[PDB]
Amino acid sequence: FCPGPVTLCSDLESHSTEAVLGDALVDFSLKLYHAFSAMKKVETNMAFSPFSIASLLTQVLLGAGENTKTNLESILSYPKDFTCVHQALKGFTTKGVTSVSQIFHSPDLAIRDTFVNASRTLYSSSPRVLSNNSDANLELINTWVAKNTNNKISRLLDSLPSDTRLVLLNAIYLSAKWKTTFDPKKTRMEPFHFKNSVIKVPMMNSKKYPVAHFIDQTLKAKVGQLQLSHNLSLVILVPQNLKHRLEDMEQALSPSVFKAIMEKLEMSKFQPTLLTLPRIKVTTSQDMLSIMEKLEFFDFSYDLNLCGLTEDPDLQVSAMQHQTVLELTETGVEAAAASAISVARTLLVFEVQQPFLFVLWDQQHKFPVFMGRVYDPR
Amino acid sequence: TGSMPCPKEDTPNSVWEPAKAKYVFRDVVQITCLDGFEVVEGRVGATSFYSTCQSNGKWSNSKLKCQPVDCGIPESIENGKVEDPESTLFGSVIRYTCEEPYYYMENGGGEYHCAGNGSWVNEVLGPELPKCVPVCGVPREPFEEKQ
Amino acid sequence: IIGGSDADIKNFPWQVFFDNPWAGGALINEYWVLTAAHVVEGNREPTMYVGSTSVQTSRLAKSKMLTPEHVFIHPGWKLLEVPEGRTNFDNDIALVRLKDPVKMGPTVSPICLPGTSSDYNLMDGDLGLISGWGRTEKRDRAVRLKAARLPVAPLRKCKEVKVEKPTADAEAYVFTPNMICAGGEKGMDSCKGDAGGAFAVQDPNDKTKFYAAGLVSWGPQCGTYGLYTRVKNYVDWIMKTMQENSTP
Numbered sequence: 001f002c003p004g005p006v007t008l009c010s011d012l013e014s015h016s017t018e019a020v021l022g023d024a025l026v027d028f029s030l031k032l033y034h035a036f037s038a039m040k041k042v043e044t045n046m047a048f049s050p051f052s053i054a055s056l057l058t059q060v061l062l063g064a065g066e067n068t069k070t071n072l073e074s075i076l077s078y079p080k081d082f083t084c085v086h087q088a089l090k091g092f093t094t095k096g097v098t099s100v101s102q103i104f105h106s107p108d109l110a111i112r113d114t115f116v117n118a119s120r121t122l123y124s125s126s127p128r129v130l131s132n133n134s135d136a137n138l139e140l141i142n143t144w145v146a147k148n149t150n151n152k153i154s155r156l157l158d159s160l161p162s163d164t165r166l167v168l169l170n171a172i173y174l175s176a177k178w179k180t181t182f183d184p185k186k187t188r189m190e191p192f193h194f195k196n197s198v199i200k201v202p203m204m205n206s207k208k209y210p211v212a213h214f215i216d217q218t219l220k221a222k223v224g225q226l227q228l229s230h231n232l233s234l235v236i237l238v239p240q241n242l243k244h245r246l247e248d249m250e251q252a253l254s255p256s257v258f259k260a261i262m263e264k265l266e267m268s269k270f271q272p273t274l275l276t277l278p279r280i281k282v283t284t285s286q287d288m289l290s291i292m293e294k295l296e297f298f299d300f301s302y303d304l305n306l307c308g309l310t311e312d313p314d315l316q317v318s319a320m321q322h323q324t325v326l327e328l329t330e331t332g333v334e335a336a337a338a339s340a341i342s343v344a345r346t347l348l349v350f351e352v353q354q355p356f357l358f359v360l361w362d363q364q365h366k367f368p369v370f371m372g373r374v375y376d377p378r
Numbered sequence: 379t380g381s382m383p384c385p386k387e388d389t390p391n392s393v394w395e396p397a398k399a400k401y402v403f404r405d406v407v408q409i410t411c412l413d414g415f416e417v418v419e420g421r422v423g424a425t426s427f428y429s430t431c432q433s434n435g436k437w438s439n440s441k442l443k444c445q446p447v448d449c450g451i452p453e454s455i456e457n458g459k460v461e462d463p464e465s466t467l468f469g470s471v472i473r474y475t476c477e478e479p480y481y482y483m484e485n486g487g488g489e490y491h492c493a494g495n496g497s498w499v500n501e502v503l504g505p506e507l508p509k510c511v512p513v514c515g516v517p518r519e520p521f522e523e524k525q
Numbered sequence: 526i527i528g529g530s531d532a533d534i535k536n537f538p539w540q541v542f543f544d545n546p547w548a549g550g551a552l553i554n555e556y557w558v559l560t561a562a563h564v565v566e567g568n569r570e571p572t573m574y575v576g577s578t579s580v581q582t583s584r585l586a587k588s589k590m591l592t593p594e595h596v597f598i599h600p601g602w603k604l605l606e607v608p609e610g611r612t613n614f615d616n617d618i619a620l621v622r623l624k625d626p627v628k629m630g631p632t633v634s635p636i637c638l639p640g641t642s643s644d645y646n647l648m649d650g651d652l653g654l655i656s657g658w659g660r661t662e663k664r665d666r667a668v669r670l671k672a673a674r675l676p677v678a679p680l681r682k683c684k685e686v687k688v689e690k691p692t693a694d695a696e697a698y699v700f701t702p703n704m705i706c707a708g709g710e711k712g713m714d715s716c717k718g719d720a721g722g723a724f725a726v727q728d729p730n731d732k733t734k735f736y737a738a739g740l741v742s743w744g745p746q747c748g749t750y751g752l753y754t755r756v757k758n759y760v761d762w763i764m765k766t767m768q769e770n771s772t773p
Contacts (some may be wrong), residue, residue: 214567215544240572241590242585267724269608271567271608341609341688341690341691342608342609342610342717343743344563345686345717345718345719345744346547346548346563346719346720346721347546347659347715348546349545353582405749424672437620457538457628457629480634512554512555512636514554514634514637515536515539515635515733515734515736516538517535517536518536519533520534520536520537521536521654523672523673523674524529524531
């Protein structure tokens with residue numbers, strides 16, 4: 001038995017599940033963060049896109065069945081019979097990034113025609129075939145990534161198995177930048193707390209940058225927001241004192257605290273703030289199968305049920321890799337707004353000079369596009 | 379038969395409610411302790427107990443004697459201190475003070491005396507401990523305007 | 526604190542420091558902190574510190590942090606008004622209730638409050654002290670505490686030529702009797718980062734203590750003159766607030 005191909009939803013039904021999709025995209029991001037931190041070292045930078053990741057998992061969930069269809073729904077925090085998630089995910093696409101999602105298969109893996117078109121319509125990409133020898137398949141994948149990523153992600157894979165049958169790929173870089181340009185002449189070497197010492201990293205500086213911020217008690221952290229282009233914004237969470245390690249801030253982030261902070265930032269006004277932070281330039285390649293097992297999802301290496309995609313009984317995911325190339329420097333859009341005159345005898349300040357956690361947020365559809373941390377700006 | 383009478387008792391801290399004289403056999407008496415005393419019936423200090431003139435001629439519950447009420451070691455207060463007295467019994471008086479230049483109490487607290495109920499009490503504050511709130515507006519180091 | 530000298534935290538043990546609204550505060554008792562309304566305006570949970578000469582990042586982690594319980598603003602304040610206080614800063618005062626009491630010592634002890642009598646009525650010739658980590662002449666940020674002596678100036682010298690068109694020039698800053706003017710002498714004044722600081726004035730009856738006569742509120746071009754919230758007019762509201770929100 002196999003549940004047939006899913007049914008197309010109407011534009012109002014899919015626009016009705018936008019609130020449903022934006023909520024599971026928050027629960028799923030937190031599960032990816034705890035998995036990524038359990039895989040990298042104790043004090044390492046990492047950057048992953050929880051959106052593009054779920055965009056490829058739901059592309060898989062389109063052709064799943066039996067236990068694989070339900071585990072993918074519980075991993076992605078989806079409700080049952082969520083038939084309008086495929087169209088709702090395509091609509092959440094933002095022009096501030098450039099991401100790719102392809103599925104490579106060996107010649108001996110027959111793809112059902114019910115999926116060749118269902119993948120080319122709901123995600124604009126049909127499964128691509130691989131060559132015969134494994135030597136060409138390695139360079140065939142990296143060049144296809146180096147072509148459809150504007151030469152940003154060059155080496156998505158370092159190796160391919162000889163018995164490669166099923167490959168899942170996703171590389172995304174950030175083409176969006178700040179809505180307000182930073183002055184490069186004010187880029188001063190400011191101190192930065194690392195481990196227990198004081199390292200000097202290149203830091204940007206702006207006396208009246210628009211930053212909407214406050215204090216949250218549940219995290220004991222300063223929560224600030226910065227406005228990007230393409231209706232995007234970068235949220236930055238810095239512990240208040242140095243008494244609280246970033247690890248303690250990580251263990252305190254719940255799905256309730258997350259949603260209680262983003263809804264407080266959508267209603268907090270951007271105010272002329274004095275700001276200082278280092279350049280953000282984090283790239284993270286990670287074997288995503290190691291992440292699936294870190295979320296107790298043992299379907300890609302055992303008992304894989306993908307009847308809607310193929311009718312092959314012996315099928316397992318041969319590889320699965322992700323790479324996020326996020327970079328933000330002194331480049332912006334609206335150079336400046338000026339218009340300062342505050343007569344109040346107070347000071348407004350937000351300063352990121354210690355290990356922190358960043359989330360690139362999509363204010364329109366309300367969902368985390370990127371998510372990561374920075375332990376060393378160097 | 380001759381109902382042997384029970385003689386009275388030197389009761390300095392107690393009073394016999396039936397009292398009278400020539401207590402006969404099968405005559406119960408209420409030995410009640412005075413204010414500031416209690417009979418510890420082996421456990422909780424009650425204000426009185428009972429004794430029956432038995433057939434021998436002595437009083438039952440002779441092992442019970444009204445003893446002075448103990449208030450116990452006084453509990454300390456926040457930003458405060460109390461000197462340990464020689465005795466914590468009834469009538470003993472203690473004294474609470476605050477810190478020197480950063481606390482001054484309220485006033486007022488004219489020392490506390492162990493009462494008959496078993497609690498430390500002050501003339502007006504009663505069973506309420508004094509509180510040490512900060513002495514306001516005290517610059518620790520005078521500020522010299524360098525000019 | 527422009528035109529001022531250095532001062533250890535012992536000179537101002539009541540001086541509270543605020544993080545998000547990089548501003549000042551004033552301790553009044555073991556449970557309540559006094560500051561400006563705009564200080565705890567957009568931040569209903571401030572980050573407070575006491576008992577520290579320096580506010581170096583290396584120092585705030587080793588200084589006593591106060592945990593606030595609730596923020597009480599004076600009802601005569603603005604609301605969702607976009608940061609620019611173009612309308613007014615009348616009734617620029619607020620009370621912060623602390624969850625934990627404050628252990629007082631050589632570097633933390635509260636300041637007294639202005640009495641209800643007529644001697645505490647501020648006037649010309651009176652002198653005052655301002656303390657804060659605001660902007661001096663060198664940097665915009667003062668790591669170690671600065672302080673300067675300011676006299677009570679007439680309010681006529683406050684109303685100065687300062688651009689007052691944040692949005693609609695039609696809006697004009699109004700001066701209320703709930704504000705005190707000071708400065709002028711040697712150019713000493715309070716600038717950005719001093720809001721909530723107590724305008725420490727010696728008590729006329731007990732000449733050994735001090736009381737907060739004003740809180741650093743607003744003003745024109747800093748270094749000239751400005752406006753401190755007259756605390757004597759809000760003594761009835763501070764007492765009616767500390768007693769209602771009792772500590773049960």
